[PDB]
């Protein structure tokens, strides 16, 4: 079964990429199953809702009492050396929260790293139904 382990925030970089202390080491983490709009796109500077997503993530993590990371059952790092995980702030999944608010869409999915896929797609469908943010 997936297990939750503790982590400490170092810096939020944008909506879906974070620097955390994990096991005593500084690491970049990329959120599983979701994509927030870019703020640093080499091409097109900020995408609509990029700054919003990024501040949402920064607020939720900076104000948390406890952060936890949850790896899925497949690869735990990507080709750029980032940890691939679900992030929980006081027990609430950051990946889901972003999607539920219309600030992220569900990513292209890669088995077997897809354990929370149905829950996130459920939240995405609700955000679209409510026409929130990127869905407006």
**Percent of sequence in beta strands:** 25-35%
> From the alpha-carbon coordinates, what is the Rg to the nearest angstrom?
14 Å
Q: What is the top-level CATH class?
A: Mainly Beta
Could you give the order of the helices and strands? EEEEHEEEHEH
Helix content estimate:
10-25%
What's the domain count? 1
Separation of termini? 37 Å
Characterize the biggest β-sheet: 5 strands, mixed, barrel
The assigned structural class equals alpha+beta
CATH topology assignment: OB fold (Dihydrolipoamide Acetyltransferase, E2P)
Counted beta strands: 8
Explain the overall architecture.
- This protein is of the alpha+beta class.
- It has one domain (1-136): OB fold (Dihydrolipoamide Acetyltransferase, E2P) (Beta Barrel).
- It has 3 helices and 8 strands.
- A hairpin with a 2-residue loop joins strand 6 (83-89) and strand 7.
- Helix 2 (94-100) packs parallel to helix 3 (117-129).
Give structural attributes.
136 residues; alpha+beta; OB fold (Dihydrolipoamide Acetyltransferase, E2P); 5-stranded mixed beta barrel; two-stranded antiparallel sheet; 8 strands
Helices and strands, with pairings:
Layout: E1 4-12, E2 17-22, E3 25-31, E4 34-35, H1 50-62, E5 67-71, E6 83-89, E7 92-93, H2 94-100, E8 105-106, H3 117-129
Parallel strand pairs: 3-6
Antiparallel strand pairs: 1-2, 1-5, 2-3, 4-8, 5-6, 6-7
């Amino acid at each position: 079964k997936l297990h939750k382990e503790p982590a400490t925030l170092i810096k939020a970089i944008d909506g879906d990429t974070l620097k955390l202390m994990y096991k005593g080491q500084p690491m970049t983490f990329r959120l599983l199953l979701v994509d927030t709009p870019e703020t640093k796109h080499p091409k097109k500077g900020v995408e609509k809702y990029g700054p919003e997503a990024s501040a949402f993530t920064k607020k939720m993590l900076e104000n948390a009492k406890k952060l936890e990371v949850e790896f899925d059952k497949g690869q735990r790092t990507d080709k750029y050396g980032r940890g691939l995980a679900y992030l929980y702030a006081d027990g609430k999944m950051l990946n889901e929260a972003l999607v539920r608010q219309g600030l992220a869409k569900v990513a292209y999915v890669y088995k077997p790293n897809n354990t929370h896929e149905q829950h996130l797609r459920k939240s995405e469908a609700q955000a679209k139904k409510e026409k929130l943010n990127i869905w407006s």
